[PDB]
Write a protein that binds this DNA or RNA. Sequence first.
RNA 1: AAACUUUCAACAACGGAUCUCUUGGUUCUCGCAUCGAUGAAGAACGCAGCGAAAUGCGAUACGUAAUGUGAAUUGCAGAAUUCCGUGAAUCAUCGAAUCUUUGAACGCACAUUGCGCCCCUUGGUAUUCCAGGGGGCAUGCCUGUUUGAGCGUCAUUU
RNA 2: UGAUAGAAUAAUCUAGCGAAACCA
RNA 3: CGUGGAGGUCAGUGACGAAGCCUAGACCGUAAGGUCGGGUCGAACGGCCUCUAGUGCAGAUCUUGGUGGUAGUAGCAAAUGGGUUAGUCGAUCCUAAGAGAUGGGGAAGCUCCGUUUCAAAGGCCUGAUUUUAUGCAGGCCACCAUCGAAAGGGAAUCCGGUUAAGAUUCCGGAACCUGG
RNA 4: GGACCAAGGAGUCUAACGUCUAUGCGAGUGUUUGGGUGUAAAACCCAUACGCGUAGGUUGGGGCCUCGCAAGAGGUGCACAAUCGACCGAUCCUGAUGUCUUCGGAUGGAUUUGAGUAAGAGCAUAGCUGUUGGGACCCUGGUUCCUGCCGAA
RNA 5: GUUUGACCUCAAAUCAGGUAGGAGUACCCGCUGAAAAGCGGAGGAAAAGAAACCAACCGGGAUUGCCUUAGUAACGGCGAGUGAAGCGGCAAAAGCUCAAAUUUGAAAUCUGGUACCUUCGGUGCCCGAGUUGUAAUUUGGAGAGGGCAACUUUGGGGCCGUUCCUUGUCUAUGUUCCUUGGAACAGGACGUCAUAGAGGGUGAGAAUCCCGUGUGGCGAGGAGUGCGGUUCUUUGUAAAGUGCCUUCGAAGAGUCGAGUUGUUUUGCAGCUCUAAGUGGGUGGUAAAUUCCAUCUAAAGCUAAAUAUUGGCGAGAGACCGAUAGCGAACAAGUACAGUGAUGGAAAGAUGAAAAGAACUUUGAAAAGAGAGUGAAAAAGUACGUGAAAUUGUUGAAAGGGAAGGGCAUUUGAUCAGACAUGGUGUUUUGUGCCCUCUGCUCCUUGUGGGUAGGGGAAUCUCGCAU
Lengths: 106, 126, 227, 156
Amino acid sequence: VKVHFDQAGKKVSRRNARATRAAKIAPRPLDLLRPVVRAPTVKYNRKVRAGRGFTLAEVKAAGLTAAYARTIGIAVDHRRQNRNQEIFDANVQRLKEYQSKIIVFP
Amino acid sequence: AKQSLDVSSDRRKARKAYFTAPSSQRRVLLSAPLSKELRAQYGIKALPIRRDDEVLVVRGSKKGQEGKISSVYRLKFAVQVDKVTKEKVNGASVPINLHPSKLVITKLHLDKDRKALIQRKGGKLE
Amino acid sequence: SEKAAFGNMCRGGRMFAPTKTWRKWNVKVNHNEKRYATASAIAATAVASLVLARGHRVEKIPEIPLVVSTDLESIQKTKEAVAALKAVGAHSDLLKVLKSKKLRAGKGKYRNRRWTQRRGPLVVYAEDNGIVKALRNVPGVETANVASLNLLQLAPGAHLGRFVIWTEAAFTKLDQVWGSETVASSKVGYTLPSHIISTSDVTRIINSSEIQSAIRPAGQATQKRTH
Amino acid sequence: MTSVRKRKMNRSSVGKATRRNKDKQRKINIQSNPIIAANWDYSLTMAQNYKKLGLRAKLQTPAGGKEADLSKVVKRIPLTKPVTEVVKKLEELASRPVIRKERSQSEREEEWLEKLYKKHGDDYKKMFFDKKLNIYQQSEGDLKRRLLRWKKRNGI
RNA sequence: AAACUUUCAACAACGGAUCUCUUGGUUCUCGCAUCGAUGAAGAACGCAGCGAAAUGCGAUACGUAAUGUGAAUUGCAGAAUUCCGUGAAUCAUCGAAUCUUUGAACGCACAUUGCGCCCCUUGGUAUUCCAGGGGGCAUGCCUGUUUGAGCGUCAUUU
RNA sequence: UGAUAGAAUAAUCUAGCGAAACCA
RNA sequence: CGUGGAGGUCAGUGACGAAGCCUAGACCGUAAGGUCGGGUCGAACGGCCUCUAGUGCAGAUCUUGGUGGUAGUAGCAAAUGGGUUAGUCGAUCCUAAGAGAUGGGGAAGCUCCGUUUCAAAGGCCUGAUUUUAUGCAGGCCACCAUCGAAAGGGAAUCCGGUUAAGAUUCCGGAACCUGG
RNA sequence: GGACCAAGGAGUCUAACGUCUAUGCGAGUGUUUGGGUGUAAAACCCAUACGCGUAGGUUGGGGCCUCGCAAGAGGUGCACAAUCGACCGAUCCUGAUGUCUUCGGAUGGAUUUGAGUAAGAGCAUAGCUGUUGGGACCCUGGUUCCUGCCGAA
RNA sequence: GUUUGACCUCAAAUCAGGUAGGAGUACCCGCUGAAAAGCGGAGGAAAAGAAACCAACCGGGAUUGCCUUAGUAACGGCGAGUGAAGCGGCAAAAGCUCAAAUUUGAAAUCUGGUACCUUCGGUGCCCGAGUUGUAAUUUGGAGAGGGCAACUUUGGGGCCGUUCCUUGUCUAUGUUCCUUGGAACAGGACGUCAUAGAGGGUGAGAAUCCCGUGUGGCGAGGAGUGCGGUUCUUUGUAAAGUGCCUUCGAAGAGUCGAGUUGUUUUGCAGCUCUAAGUGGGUGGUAAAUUCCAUCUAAAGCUAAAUAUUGGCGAGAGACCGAUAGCGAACAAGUACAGUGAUGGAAAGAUGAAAAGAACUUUGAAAAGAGAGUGAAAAAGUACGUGAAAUUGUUGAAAGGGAAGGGCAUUUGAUCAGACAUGGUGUUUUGUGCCCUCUGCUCCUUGUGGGUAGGGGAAUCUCGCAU
C-alpha cells in the first residue's frame, strides 16, 4: 500500500530541478536536440515521435562530426539506422534549422 | 503575513522557543521602549534593558512609579526595579517582578558597548 | 499509529477502526462542471441582492458590478489603495471585516487556526503592477487574476455572490477569458452554457397577457367553508 | 520525535544543529553569464524569462499547454450564415573575435629550417633525400609547410 | 418518648467525572547525508559551596582554552566591572586541549586488581641497586625496507 | 536492636490494628 | 434531536462573567431534547446554511478508576550513622582427574578433531676466527602455550593488651623468612 | 447477567462488479501520469496519447387537430406491445453456370435463431444502496437518539 | 670452484606506512528459509545501466521510474484463482574504459625514502616495482600506418570579483482620552503604519508595548572552479581534428552448448560431457537443397529521473486534548516484576505575583484557633473547575421486622405572580421643522432630500408640551 501524497510536492521539487539545472545551463536549453522519428508497430506506424539520437551518417550529412555535435547539444545514437528517405531528410532540415539559430561562444 | 518559508507560525513551536530561550536571547527579549524625550535624544524607540539605568512604570497596579533597576531577573523574564516592593507582614521587603514591555526607560546608563549599539542602530547619539 | 488490553472497549487498547491514510481525500470533478460552477459564481456576483444576501456592506457603492480604472493596478502602497477603496465606498465592508475578528470556538484554536473573521471585497486585475502587495496587508481583501478566478474565493462557503471589484482592463479581459457569442472562448472547446428557460421571471410569464387570456377564472384563493 | 536519539537530543544541552534552507531553495542565481545575470528577473520563470529573452527554453514539444496569455481578441467564425536585444548582445559577443595568437615556431627547429634553407635553398627533392639535418626524414610538403611558415615569420 | 431504620433538604466529607488549556504525541510533505582501532555505540565510577533524579563533564571532571555579545547568576551562600572595559554570564558560538575504568577492545593473562617486556626522563651515596614520572608492546591483510634460510634452480680454469 | 500490647502467675477479657469470599 | 471538527454568515455572545457544574425554579417541545431564572465558576463559546466523522450505551461474568455492604467482622507475620588495617592466615605459585589455543587436518558453515602431534616452534658460549683491511665467523644445547585445588603440594609470628562493634592483620615487647 | 457510580466501549475503511438518483456533456465522454502557471500540497490553463461507448404493413395508443353546445365522431398518431412481413447470420435439403475429378454454390425451400438490421446513448463525477474479498460490528454473549409511515413468514 | 654469485621460494622483524572488524540498519543488494525470522554487505541512495535488445513495422534504440497496455496474454485438480510483456505518453536523459597485432631508434610507467619548495601536491636525487609488460595510441560507431591538400586548435597558473555554505548586524506606526477591572491586551472616542493585520510574550481578545513579521541594506569567516575580469607565464619540429589517396586491418573457452539432478516458473546451482571462426546468438519467413531480419555473449565503470516507519534538520494538519494521543505531555523504558531472556505502570493545572499564611495561643507531635496575605483561600504547596456512587451532622417526615412507582386530590412547607398605570374627545397657555418673508446646499432632477436668518401665533392651523 502506497499513496502519492507528494504528487503536488514532487512536481514543485521537479520544477526546482528544472529551475536549478537551468541555472547552471543558463543560455542552453535543458534538453538536447532530438530526432523526429516515425514509430514502429502498425498501430503507431503513422505516428511520428521524438527519437533518441540521429546517426553518424546523418550528422555528417549535416556537415559536422558527432563528437563535436555532442558539444553543441545534439543527441546522437550510433545504434539506430536510417532507412527511410523522408525521415532522414526532415531530420537533416531539423539539424540545419538548429544550426541556423545557435550562436556559439569561443 | 509570513512570507518566508523559513519563518514558522506554529503556536507550539513559538512557545517552545519562548520558554526555552537562552539568556543571551532573553536580554534581547527583555526590551523596553524609550521615552519620548529619549527618542528625541537619540532617535530610537526600544532598547535591551540592563540594570544600571533608570525607568518608569506605565502599566500595572504600581502605575506611575519609577526607579533604578535593582536587578534583571532574566530567568523569570522579569526585572526587579529598586523601591517598588511589597512589604510582607513580617516587615521584610520583596520587589515586584516587573516586565520591561510595561516599562518606559527614563535615564539610560551609557557605556561604550551601549554607545556603539546606539550608533549601529542609527542613533543620533550626543 | 500502526500497531500502537487489545480491545476497543479497553483502556489503552487498540481502537475500533484504526484510521488509515488511504481513505479518499481529494475528489475528482468533471472539468466542465467545475467551470460551470465558476461561471454561475461570476454571473451571481453582478446581482448584488445576492451580495447583500450573503452579507456585505455595499449599500453605498457607485454601481454593480463595480468597475474601477486599470490605474488601480499601478498602486504599490497600502494606504493609497485603502484610500482608493474609501473613495469607492467599500469602506463599510472593510470595517465590518475588521470588527469581525473573533477567536475560534473549537479546539482548532490551538491547532494554528486561532482567529476567524469575515471576508470582504475581491479585486480582479488583468495584470499586477504592485497592487497585490498593496492590498496584501489589509484584511478581508483578496486579489485574483482573471485567468484563475478561484471558486473558493468566488463563493465562499458555497454562498453565491461575494463582493467583487473589477479593474477596467480585467472587465474587458473577462470576454477573453470566457468568450461570448462574439469572442471565442480562449478555452479549448469551451462554451458559455445555455439556459433551459429564457425568462428568469415565472410570475411575469404567468401574468403576462396571453396566458392571462387563455386561463379560466380563479377561485377565492382560500376556500369558502361550507357545512 | 519518539526515537531515543531524538528525545535525548531534545533534552540535551547541546541544542539542535538547525539550518534554514527552504526559503533559499526557490531562488537561484544563474552563475554563468553576466549578461543573463543582468536580464534575469527572479519573478517570471525559467520559461517566461527565457521567452522574454528570445532563447528557446525547451527544445521541442512541451507537454501541456503554454500560456497564449490573451495577446489578441479572437472572434467567432460566422460559418457563412444566410443573408531580441539581449539576443543581439550575445550575438555580438559570440560575433566578437577573441584576441588570438598565431602559433609560432620553436627556435631549434626554425634554426634547423634555416640550415636547410641555406644548404639546399628552396628545392625540396634534394632536401628530402638529405641525410644530415633531415634525420627525422620529414614529409614532402611538411617541409614545404614549415618553410613557408618560417618565411612568413622571417626572411620573406 | 427516646434510640434505630428509611426518605428528602441544608452544610460538611469522599471522589476525581465534566469544562478550558498543553514545551506532548500522531500523520504528511520538503531538504540534507554525517558513527569506528585518530578507539564508535553501550556499560561502570566519579566531578557542583550547599544535588536526589534530568542534563553536562572527566581528576583541567555541571568544566579549560578560543570567538562573539556585553552585565550578570539567582533557592541560599559568595565573588564582582576599576565600568567605558582584554569583561560577569548555568550566555551564545566552538575550529585548541583534557578525557577515569571498560567496551569492536588491543602486552600476556584474568575467579588474580596476577604476570610482564621495551623505550624516554628524574631522583635516591649511584657504574651495579632502588624509587618516581611518561610512552608504547592484539590479530589479519597490503606495499616497501632490513635480516636470514632452502639438497629449489643455475653459473663458476680470461 | 527487635518485636500487637495490657491483664488473667510467665496457663479469658480489654485495647490497638484490621481483611477477603460474596453481593437482579 | 444530540456530539467533535471545517467553510460561510450573524460587523452573534462574553471578565458588568464564556464554557462547565448544581438547581424540592420557570417555560416550550409527542419525544429525542431545547430556552431562561438562581447558585457556583473563572476564559472562551454559540445560532443559522452547508461539509465531515474515532458522532449518541445499561448491560458485553466489557476496560480503567472511585465507593459501598460484608464488618469493627474474620482474624492478629493474612501488608506494616559507625565498623572489616597482614612480608609471616589465605588467595596468588605447583600440578591432579580433566579442560584447551598454536602448527595442521576436516566441515556449505555455526565451528569440529587434536595437545606434542608429519612445524624453520629459541637462547647460551667464544671470537686481532688474520687478513682482503668500513658487510658475521666458529660452535653448544635439546621438549613444548595456557587453565585446572580458599580441604592435595607449599618460606616465614608468637605472647600480653585494647574496641559499642576489629584483630595470629591495630598497640607494646619479643621473633623469624625471602631478595639485594 | 448483574454491589453501585463515573469515563471509555462495538457495522469503520478500502477494492471489484450492480441497481437507483442527481449533475455536466452528448455519439461522444473522461483536466489533475504528466507539463505550464500560482497569492503555492489550493486554484487556473493544457500538448500527445490512453480508457469506455458510438460507427415495411395492420391493430392499438399518450396526446394533438377538426367537427360537434355537450355527449361523441373523424384524422394524424409518442412511448411500448401483438400480428404479418422483409433482410442479414445460422440451420438442413435443392446442387445449376461452370467443372483440373473432386472443386463449386446458383436458385428454390424449411423451422427456429438473434439485448440482429430496418435511424444511436453513452462517458464522467457525486450520493444512497446490493454481492464478494480484505481482521471487516465487537469479544456463545453483547451491539449506543427520537418520532411517523409501511409491515410478513 | 670444497669457492663465489645470480636468481627463485619461504621465513623473520617492538622496521616504515596504511587498512579490516563494532554500532545502527527506514530504504537497497546477496544468501538461507518456515509456520516472516535469520545471515552477510553497502550508500545517500543502492541496484540496474550503454543490447549476443525489442520487433516484423513507413521499424525502434542504455538503464530507471510513473500512466496505459491489463486484470489482458499466459498459467492453474484451466479449481481456488495466479498473473506478465512489446508498443504508446511522460519524467529523466550521457556516455564511456579494458583485453587483440612492437616504442623497439632506446620502460618512454609507478610506489616508497630523502633534500627542498608555493604542500589534498610539486621538483630533484636514490632505492626499488616492472619486459611473466608498467606508459602513449586503438575498443567496431572501427581503427592503425603512411602520403597529399589544406585549414583549425592549443596548456598552465595567480589575484580580485561572482557563485555556494556558515554566520553577524541594521531596517515601520498610540502605549492618545473615558468606563469597567486586582491587572486593560476588554468596551467606547480620536488616531498612525503597512511590501509589516504571520506568530508569540507582556497580570484578560495587543498591527501600532516588546520580540518579531515585511521590505531592503551592511558585514564576517569559509568552500570552490562554476564563470567574469585582470595579471604572470607558457614551443617543443608539441598535441589533435576534418576530407582524399595508398597499405593494412588482431579480440572475452571449463566458456557457448548437451545430458542429468535439485530449485524456481523459464532461469539459476551442482555433477558429467564439452565447441566454432565468412564465427556465434536470437526471431520470423517459405511458391521451399528457403531467404531475410537483428545483435556480438562469456571483461569493467557511469550521474539524473527511484525507494526511504533510520539519522540530521525544517514546515505543515477538517488528527488526539491527559482512560485520547507514543508505553511514556511528569526525573518513562522510569519505578517495579522476573535468575534471565524479557515484561512494564501510575503520575499535567496554587496564584498575575509566593504575595506560600509575620505575630499570639492550644498542641508530644500530628493538627488547630485567633490573625493576616491575596481580586478570589467559595485559590493554603492535600491546592483551576470540582459531577455521581458513597459518608457525617442538623432539620422535617415516615416506620416498626416498613419494598418501589403510576394516576388523582387534599394538607403542610414553599415559590412565582405589573418597575402596568393608559387611550379617546374637548379646553387653557407656551413652544418648534406651525405660519410668513428672505436663503444656502445634495443629486436619484421628482409626487425629491438636507439646511440657515429674521418675524408672528395679534388671527388661523399642525406637531409638541401644558
